[PDB]
Amino acid sequence: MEHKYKNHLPKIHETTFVAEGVHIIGDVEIGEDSNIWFNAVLRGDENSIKIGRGTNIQDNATLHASEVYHEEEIEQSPTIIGDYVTVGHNCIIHGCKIGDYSLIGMGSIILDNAEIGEYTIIGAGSLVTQNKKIPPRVLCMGSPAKVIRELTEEEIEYLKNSAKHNIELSKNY
Amino acid sequence: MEHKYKNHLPKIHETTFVAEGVHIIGDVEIGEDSNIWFNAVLRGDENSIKIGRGTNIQDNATLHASEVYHEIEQSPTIIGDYVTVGHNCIIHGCKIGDYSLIGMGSIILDNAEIGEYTIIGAGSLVTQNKKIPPRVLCMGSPAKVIRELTEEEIEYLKNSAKHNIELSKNY
Amino acid sequence: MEHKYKNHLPKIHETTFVAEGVHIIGDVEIGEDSNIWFNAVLRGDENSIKIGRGTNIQDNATLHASEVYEQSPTIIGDYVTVGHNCIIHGCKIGDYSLIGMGSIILDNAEIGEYTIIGAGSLVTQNKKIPPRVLCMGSPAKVIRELTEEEIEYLKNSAKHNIELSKNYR
Amino acid sequence: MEHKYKNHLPKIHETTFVAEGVHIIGDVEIGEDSNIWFNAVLRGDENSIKIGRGTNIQDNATLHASEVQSPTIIGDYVTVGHNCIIHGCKIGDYSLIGMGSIILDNAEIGEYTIIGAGSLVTQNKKIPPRVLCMGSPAKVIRELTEEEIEYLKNSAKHNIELSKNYRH
């Protein structure tokens, strides 16, 4: 489950649910009520990974980041995931930032220095390339993904429930 | 860990780093200083899998090959030296030249050939029998050759390869 | 002509050539041997504008930036060529680069050194263009690495514009 | 900066800010708190130019009209970006024309609309209000987000404040 890397060892809240097959490596911080599902890998060796509270990383997904060059003309984001975020099955989340309540559709890929605003839906099977800034409260999908439109209030209320229901799921385990 | 398939046991160099959750099955050969990362599956039952020196197979990736027929020729999976296969890739019965980079989430199908010093963009699909030249950038689904690589990108593939080796040493 | 904005006065090297019709406003710094051509506008009021050494801003172009309260100032390297009627907006341009006439470079874009942007190109916000390439189109795409003749042309283009400006006043 | 053409003199509100290098010619009407930035050209000789209040015409832009048959009518709190070509079109309140864009005759840009930089809006094109429209030739992409609408509400009002910091 946990593995140290250099001097780093994962800082995982007591209420975080961690399923079987998961591997969390190195500089990884995970907050309260977050749930990490089967065979997910969170490899915080190149750069850190921070995951807020109430966030779900679903099965077979991978979180990582590109190698840091310690140059100043090269912005190089770590992996920062907010609260009540849903990261779908088999996603690849790579050195990007994801705002609160957002939903990354299963099988999507998010590359380094991209930013997903809060309350945003990434369609399944999408690809968000490096340095793409996705605003809050939109639907964004495709390969490479396009901003389609602002979300409806019904879709926003859905985001308000998605990650909380996954928390409820993890407690019955 | 490692699993027997018929008469075949994996041949793995003693400096190969094999992370936890990995399954390596059957006719699989892995060379010096290579790194197989967490939950990768290397299933050499249908055909063989040969991985050179200093190569990285990243997390949650799958290596396999299609069933060989008694025909039409089936390619095994052959991966050169200092190659990087990205997270959650599917590498299926193809050949990959030295120093190339398979962007995370890509799918490379049977009898395809990736030239050396080539970059496959993340999320690409390289279809059956497609032949990618060396020293190019290739991406999309289905993937197409975009352009030649710059000297900086080529130097990146060189300098990157070694860095992936030091990373495993700290484990 | 030079104009003050709040507390800011342009800081212009004594060897900089500034052509007639030019307006330079506020927080703008221009290095030695640079040449600013007819009717160009360098408005450093939302954010600062920095231009290095031996750089040419050609005729009728505009340099500006977006309001700040992350947002990038305008930073132009040494021996850079900004072609006629270009719009240079809150971006970073590395040494010896050539911005094709009529191009538009938006905020937080970065142009690597020794690169050519083709005429009439559009480089949108947050795009990172590597060094030593040809990049063109609207929106622009990286096309290929530059040949050695093109890198040589870049070594000389800005310097020719220096000598050119010396023949004026 | 102000020029006569035949019977027509520019009617420019007193609070309008006009930068150096500007030339305003003929039948041009500019409303209160508008600001016209360096080296812009507003040529009302083939036809009239009407500009509402709080509108900014940015640097090195050009306003004109084809030979007469729509004139150039720009609403309130509009932003016309640097080096634009605005030609015999109508632009509604609060809209933003991205720098380097070209708007041709009888085109109409709805209110609270964003035209992306470097776009080309061809003759007789009607662009709806509250959309993002961009490209050459331009396409309507989508409706603007609330955050983009809020940005438009503040865009020209901040430009008015920008101009006060200058010498009039």
Partner: peptide, 8 residues
């Protein structure tokens, strides 16, 4: 816009 695929 987006269109371009800068890098990777």
């Amino acid at each position: 816009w987006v269109a371009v695929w800068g890098d990777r």
